[PDB]
């Protein structure tokens, strides 16, 4: 999970940046990654606001600390965790990275990736592991 999740986060963020015309140079596993990439595209297809409100609540700068990131991300889970909210969490991180590149703060991309892995391992893996693990995610979104 530690390294697994780190790799999962980097893959999704790299996918999103590539897809959107940005560089990703600031950085069954294969089945998990693919399922998550598609899940995110489906999610963003419906919700296209890009978490403007949440990103505004965060207004990320090189000075922003994890605790602030954690506090804002917690908003997605006020009613607890579920697969859709985990997908939204990945999408939110992608949105934060795109925003960071648009502001010429590409230095933040690897930082956001680290923050996401930390948050995933700390707050989301408990629920994930209790509900089938990533195997169930693939089975549900693959």
Swiss-Prot record:
According to its UniProt entry, the protein's GO biological process terms are: apoptotic mitochondrial changes; apoptotic process in bone marrow cell; cellular response to alkaloid; cellular response to amino acid stimulus; cellular response to gamma radiation; defense response to virus; dendritic cell apoptotic process; dendritic cell proliferation
Q: What positions carry the motif BH3?
A: 32-46
Where, by residue number, is the motif BH4? 4-24
Q: Tell me, what is one Gene Ontology molecular-function annotation carried by this entry?
A: channel activity
Domain comment (free text) = The BH4 motif is required for anti-apoptotic activity. The BH1 and BH2 motifs are required for both heterodimerization with other Bcl-2 family members and for repression of cell death. The loop between motifs BH4 and BH3 is required for the interaction with NLRP1.
Question: What does it do?
Answer: Potent inhibitor of cell death. Inhibits activation of caspases. Appears to regulate cell death by blocking the voltage-dependent anion channel (VDAC) by binding to it and preventing the release of the caspase activator, CYC1, from the mitochondrial membrane. Also acts as a regulator of G2 checkpoint and progression to cytokinesis during mitosis. Isoform Bcl-X(L) also regulates presynaptic plasticity, including neurotransmitter release and recovery, number of axonal mitochondria as well as size and number of synaptic vesicle clusters. During synaptic stimulation, increases ATP availability from mitochondria through regulation of mitochondrial membrane ATP synthase F(1)F(0) activity and regulates endocytic vesicle retrieval in hippocampal neurons through association with DMN1L and stimulation of its GTPase activity in synaptic vesicles.
Protein name from the UniProt record = Bcl-2-like protein 1
What is the organism of origin for this protein?
A: Homo sapiens (Human)
Entire-sequence positions represented here:
1 to 196 of 233
């Amino acid at each position: 999970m530690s390294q697994s999740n780190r790799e999962l986060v980097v893959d999704f963020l790299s996918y999103k940046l590539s897809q959107k015309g940005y560089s990703w140079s600031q950085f069954p596993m294969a089945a998990v990654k693919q399922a998550l990439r598609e899940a995110g595209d489906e999610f963003e297809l419906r919700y296209r606001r890009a978490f403007s409100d949440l990103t505004s609540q965060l207004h990320i700068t090189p000075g922003t600390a994890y605790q602030s990131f954690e506090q804002v991300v917690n908003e997605l889970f006020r009613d607890g965790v579920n697969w859709g909210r985990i997908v939204a969490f990945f999408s939110f991180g992608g949105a934060l990275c795109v925003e960071s590149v648009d502001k010429e703060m590409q230095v933040l991309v690897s930082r956001i990736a680290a923050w996401m892995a930390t948050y995933l391992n700390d707050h989301l893996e408990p629920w994930i592991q209790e509900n089938g693990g990533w195997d169930t995610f693939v089975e549900l979104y693959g």
